[PDB]
From a paper:
In the present work, we utilized cryo-ET and cryo-STA to study the structure of SARS-CoV-2 viruses that were inactivated by β-propiolactone (BPL). We found that only local searches with C3 symmetry with restriction of the Euler angles that had prior values during particle picking could yield a high-resolution (10.9 Å) map according to the gold standard FSC coefficient at 0.143. From the averaged map of postfusion S, we clearly distinguished the head region (connector), stalk region (6-HB), and TM region. The in situ structure of postfusion S of SARS-CoV-2 has a length of ∼210 Å and a width of ∼87 Å at the ectodomain. Compared to previous recombinant structures with indistinct TM locations, the TM domain can be easily discerned in our in situ map beneath the HR2 trimer. Since the local density map of the TM region was not good enough to distinguish individual helices, we fitted the predicted model of the TM domain (Trp1212 to Leu1234) in the map. In addition, the three helices of HR2 could be clearly distinguished from the helices of HR1 in the 6-HB region. Among them, we observed seven N-glycosylation sites (N709, N717, N1098, N1134, N1158, N1173, and N1194) with clear densities in our map. We did not observe an obvious density for N-glycosylation at N1074, suggesting either no glycosylation or a low level of glycosylation for this site in our sample. We noticed that our previously reported crystal structure of SARS-CoV-2 S 6-HB fits well in our in situ map, suggesting that 6-HB is highly stable even on the membrane of natural viruses.
Residue numbers in the entry:
A (entry chain A), B (entry chain C), C (entry chain B): 703 to 770, 912 to 1173, 1180 to 1197, 1212 to 1234
The structure:
């Protein structure tokens, strides 16, 4: 089911008013080349310095936009003397042995102290080197942790700049088409006279006059709009006994009883003629179908982030450091000596009788002589 | 060499069938604004959190799409006594000296032990701090190593999202042009009648009827297609004696002997007239050349990656740590003493004869008295 | 103020020359699919390996482009013996005590040496682990510091590749429109004859002949250009007593005294008639204004980098490491002993007279006997 022979009330102009139309068309586009430094980063120093590492894409993007008883006592004397002498010998040996052992102890202790001092020096050097290296690590750590975010924001603003570039290229591709439309509107209407409805001025084109504009052209079309029009029932064809008679460069204005081939753009009824109407056969209407399907582009569909990530993403986690736990590396006699020191500090007739006998003997001799 | 005066067999319609054409044109486009979170990252948490750092480009991209024998013994006694006394003095001095030296050794050893304990404590604090700091370093190391890859995939999907945006802007720029074509097809054919071939319905336009569609317009053009046509040899001009006579709004259908100015769209031969043909001079054909060169944009050519990289890329490599190598910091007498200890443990008449003589003397005196 | 009734000198053709126009139109575009590996990174290995982490955007971008005196002496003997004995006892006790204390010192010193060796071993293990871990840290540090710059350049070249993609989609969207123009130029001019000025060949179209081209179509339009034309003063309408008479499919060539409705495309003056001119009322000119405003897209304006940065940017700075400063962990008697050692090395009649008396007594007895 379609609509061919049906006569409906369509307006046919009974009259016109002269008219003019001022039609503006942009024909050129300013080359809006873009500074990406100010656009993406602008005044912030770190992102500006990072943009330098983003290459010359900037000019590249501008590339798009710039175009487009005497004996025993003597024996005891010898005894005490020899005991004392042997004692002296063992004291001297005790002394020598104790001195040697004490010196070896004083040696090993001082060697332990020397090892302590050398270990202290070596460990101090170790700790200085470690502090320096780990400080360098943490400092460059913080710098990288900042710069990765600054670059992430730069990358996210790159998408905005590229959307800007894309929309600008779109606009310039529309500009060149509007310039071609300007060219043909100049051709068909300033050099000539357009026969098409509303083309080159509202109504029907009589004349055109071109004028320039900073990026466009304006046409003053003197035309005529229909001052008055009347709705006549009209059939683009009428089928008489199986033969389709359809007007020749006109329309079947249906009069009260007759069909006239009137002018489409003016009420001027003119009777059906085979010179006013072409004739067909079989009363058959060819049905056409047209769909101007504008191109639908192949949009870039992606996987979900997890699949495209774990495809290459390695989830490497470095281990907790564990290092060696050095925490697991664990007078009475002097009194006796001093006591024995202080303790060692602590334990540090015949002639007369015989003479009397001799005197008595002499006395007796004297008495005997006296008698 | 071109083709002007040559008459070739071109079809001229002997007849027509009435016809209708249903012509669909999309006039509007849905604003397919895009969520970038679901598009790029979707459900994965880490990339979603990272997208927050990518700025509001999302809305920005939507911005595009929402628009668009007694004396000697006494002397020896004195000797042993004085020897013993002097020995005692040297024993006491040996004792005092050994005690002082032994106490100094016991002091320095305990000082070495104290230094050991203090060094152990200081080193334990050192190792705890180092473990904590390097664990922090390695942990944030792993996190950054993951996030840089997650952001790399985000950045690579940003290109897909921007290609989507670009293709959508392309499609909308085609949509607005199809809407303008819809406007002119309404104008020249519903308000009027198109004179152009196949424009507004297959064949030749008789009438049009517009109807809307969710994003388009459909025109029912009642037209006429040529039911029958015959191939007549035709010359767009014929040059009689150096003067080019070319039909006036018609074509030179070459009859068996004559040229007729027939209607282009219908076989209706009509004899050459100067009202049927314009006349030229010199038989000269102007040759025109036209190339509608669609704009070829300035594509953003780049250097190779090495030149744009080493331009700013610094290949800094931190050195291998080297730190101090602390690995390079390297009884007989007691027996004699004990032996001498245990060794030191080990070496810890006249009256009668004279009385007999006196008795003999008294005996003699008695005998003498008896005589 | 506009321009309707004013008659200006416009050229009307007095004559024509036959002509031909060779019109080339590109109708198809080669699918310039792009390898992103060679484009962005090319031959450099590290950026190539990094591109693998950028996902399959490559094909996605191709998705766009592929489409689109005896007793005292004895007492002194006992004295020296007991003094010596007690001295021996205190020497033995001094010996035992000194030996025990010296052995305890030799024990504690060797324990200090053992603790030194164990601490050395534990610290060597600690230093080896620390060196390994911090070397790993610094090495992956340098690698990440290089890769972030390589990826930054990749991301900056992604913008160039996307600008290329956008411009290519622009070009293909122009290609399909040029193909539609080719379609209509074939329709209205090879199947028919164009009535529009310069459309399908310079001048006025007589015939067209289509021919293919690797991505285009060329039409040979036999047309006629105006050989001669004369500038006649012309008014698209003239207002007689308030009624606008404007020519019917012609122009008012202003003769010396009269207006003729001449053919626009040929000097053929024909007198004003109501069949040559439509008539209006009130002498009123309708003034129309038209501006074909090509779509200006909503460009993605961004904040300054600081606001979009500090929105999520955290300026975390890890502290300077400070670790424990281990630098803060700080014979006369033997002479006396040896002196006393060497010093200790250093201090290691009655019968005859009575017999003579007895002999004198016997001598006296002998003398007495002799008397
Ligand atoms: C039709 O409407 C247009 C708006 O959609 C508008 O075109 C505009 O014309 C002005 C003229 O003042 C332009 O303004 C500019 O002024 C000068 C001259 O071009 C330039 O040097 C400036 O940099 C600035 O761009 C507008 O740019 C222009 N609009 C657009 C979108 O380009 C007019 O009202 C009509 N068109 C014409 C051509 O007049
Ligand atoms: C369409 O039908 C209309 C109605 O028949 C017709 O208009 C009519 O035209 C006739 C002829 O001119 C007139 O007939 C009478 O005209 C005058 C009166 O005006 C008399 O003096 C004559 O003797 C004659 O009887 C009708 O008056 C007139 N009717 C109307 C309503 O205008 C159209 O001419 C027809 N159109 C075509 C193209 O045929
Ligand atoms: C990167 O880091 C996460 C580590 O915290 C990582 O997670 C872990 O993935 C492994 C391997 O898929 C899982 O190991 C076990 O997984 C299932 C769960 O029961 C078992 O059947 C397996 O046999 C295997 O033993 C861990 O369970 C999982 N851990 C967690 C906490 O999820 C993720 O892949 C990454 N994280 C992010 C946010 O991307
Ligand atoms: C010409 O062919 C077109 C296909 O190239 C197709 O246009 C399509 O029309 C349908 C109508 O059902 C649209 O479908 C949609 O349905 C409604 C109404 O628009 C929307 O709300 C939905 O979201 C959905 O988009 C198609 O979208 C549309 N095609 C395109 C590419 O837009 C028709 O067959 C013909 N055109 C018309 C206007 O009918
Ligand atoms: C970043 O890291 C690479 C280091 O492994 C770096 O490479 C090296 O570049 C230097 C600079 O030219 C070369 O140095 C020297 O080249 C020769 C080799 O002996 C000498 O005779 C010269 O006098 C000069 O001193 C190194 O040779 C080169 N490394 C190697 C192993 O050849 C690269 O620039 C970067 N690597 C990547 C993958 O981008
Ligand atoms: C109108 O001017 C065009 C230049 O703007 C140019 O079209 C060009 O035609 C040549 C033909 O040799 C193409 O060259 C190519 O050659 C073959 C055939 O297409 C291809 O396989 C090659 O890969 C190569 O592309 C040009 O590509 C083409 N120009 C463009 C921009 O596509 C002609 O001078 C005129 N047009 C025609 C259709 O002839
Ligand atoms: C526009 O005005 C022109 C000037 O009046 C007019 O041309 C004139 O046409 C008349 C009639 O053909 C000529 O009148 C004379 O013609 C010949 C001489 O050539 C005499 O034999 C006749 O008796 C008559 O007197 C004029 O000579 C001629 N003038 C010129 C300069 O050509 C145009 O015809 C007018 N155009 C229209 C459409 O009316
Ligand atoms: C990231 O690193 C910079 C650190 O070097 C950081 O800068 C510092 O920002 C703080 C926060 O405002 C400022 O702090 C104090 O500033 C004045 C100084 O006394 C006080 O009166 C305020 O109350 C506030 O407490 C620091 O002064 C500022 N650093 C310096 C040297 O001025 C920046 O935000 C970041 N740097 C870059 C390049 O982005
Ligand atoms: C060992 O014996 C001596 C002698 O009895 C004592 O020593 C005297 O020590 C006091 C200590 O103040 C001095 O004031 C005296 O001058 C010392 N005596 C002499 C003679 O000088 C004491 O019992 C022991 N000596 C010590 C412990 O040094
Ligand atoms: C020093 O000499 C004494 C006395 O001869 C000895 O000591 C005795 O040691 C034994 C060891 O078991 C004890 O059972 C005895 O009781 C000790 N004697 C007395 C009287 O009690 C030994 O040769 C030396 N003393 C030592 C080595 O302590
Ligand atoms: C203790 O006294 C002895 C005996 O007077 C001295 O020793 C002698 O030491 C010298 C050292 O060269 C030897 O050559 C002699 O052979 C030793 N004497 C004997 C008998 O062998 C010395 O004054 C002291 N002994 C020491 C210091 O060992
Ligand atoms: C055409 O109009 C006439 C009167 O104006 C009417 O009688 C006739 O039925 C109409 N044709 C159709 C097909 O409706
Ligand atoms: C229409 O035009 C005719 C003839 O030109 C005239 O008689 C009639 O009055 C006009 N009507 C209007 C409304 O202009
Ligand atoms: C090491 O020190 C601990 C402290 O708790 C103490 O018991 C002892 O002196 C050492 N440990 C051992 C097990 O010897
Ligand atoms: C035109 O056709 C006629 C017959 O149809 C023929 O005689 C003549 O040679 C043709 N013209 C040319 C230039 O071939
Ligand atoms: C063509 O039209 C003519 C006149 O209208 C007619 O005589 C002839 O039969 C028609 N031929 C065909 C094939 O329709
Ligand atoms: C340190 O230890 C080594 C172990 O090989 C051993 O020879 C000695 O006791 C020390 N080294 C030196 C050179 O004194
Ligand atoms: C039109 O031209 C004629 C002579 O060619 C002149 O007399 C008249 O003034 C012109 N009309 C206008 C409005 O200038
Ligand atoms: C213009 O055409 C006419 C008639 O065709 C002729 O008389 C006149 O000489 C031609 N003039 C030129 C310059 O061709
Ligand atoms: C530790 O060494 C310093 C070296 O300057 C020295 O004065 C002393 O032996 C120790 N320091 C103290 C305060 O005891």
């Amino acid at each position: 089911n379609s609509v061919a022979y049906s006569n409906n009330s369509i307006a046919i102009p009974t009259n016109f008013t002269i008219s003019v139309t001022t039609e503006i068309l942009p024909v050129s586009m300013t080359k809006t080349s873009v500074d990406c430094t100010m656009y993406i980063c602008g005044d912030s120093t770190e992102c500006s310095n990072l943009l330098l590492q983003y290459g010359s894409f900037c000019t590249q993007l501008n590339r798009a936009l710039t175009g487009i008883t005497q004996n025993v006592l003597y024996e005891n004397q010898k005894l005490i003397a020899n005991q004392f002498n042997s004692a002296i010998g063992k004291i001297q040996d005790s002394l020598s042995s104790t001195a040697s052992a004490l010196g070896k102890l004083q040696d090993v202790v001082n060697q332990n102290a020397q090892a302590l001092n050398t270990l202290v020096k070596q460990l101090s050097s170790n700790f200085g080197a470690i502090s320096s290296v780990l400080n360098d690590i943490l400092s460059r750590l913080d710098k990288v942790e900042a710069e990765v975010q600054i670059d992430r924001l730069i990358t996210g603003r790159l998408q905005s700049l590229q959307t800007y570039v894309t929309q600008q290229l779109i606009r310039a591709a529309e500009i060149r088409a509007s310039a071609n439309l300007a060219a043909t509107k100049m051709s068909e209407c300033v050099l000539g006279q357009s026969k098409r409805v509303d083309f080159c001025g509202k109504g029907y084109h009589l004349m055109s006059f071109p004028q320039s504009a900073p990026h466009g052209v304006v046409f003053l079309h003197v035309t005529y709009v229909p001052a008055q029009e009347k709705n006549f029932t009209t059939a683009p064809a009428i089928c008489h006994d199986g033969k389709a008679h359809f007007p020749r460069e006109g329309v079947f204005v249906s009069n009260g009883t007759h069909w006239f081939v009137t002018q489409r753009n003016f009420y001027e009824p003119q009777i059906i003629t085979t010179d006013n109407t072409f004739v067909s056969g079989n009363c058959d209407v060819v049905i056409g179908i047209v769909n101007n399907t504008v191109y639908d582009p192949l949009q870039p569909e992606l996987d979900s982030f997890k699949e495209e990530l774990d495809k290459y993403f390695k989830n490497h986690t470095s281990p907790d450091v564990d290092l060696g736990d050095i925490s697991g590396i664990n007078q009475k006699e002097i009194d006796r000596l001093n006591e024995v020191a202080k303790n060692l500090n602590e334990s540090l007739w015949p002639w007369y009788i015989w003479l009397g006998f001799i005197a008595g003997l002499i006395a007796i001799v004297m008495v005997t002589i006296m008698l």
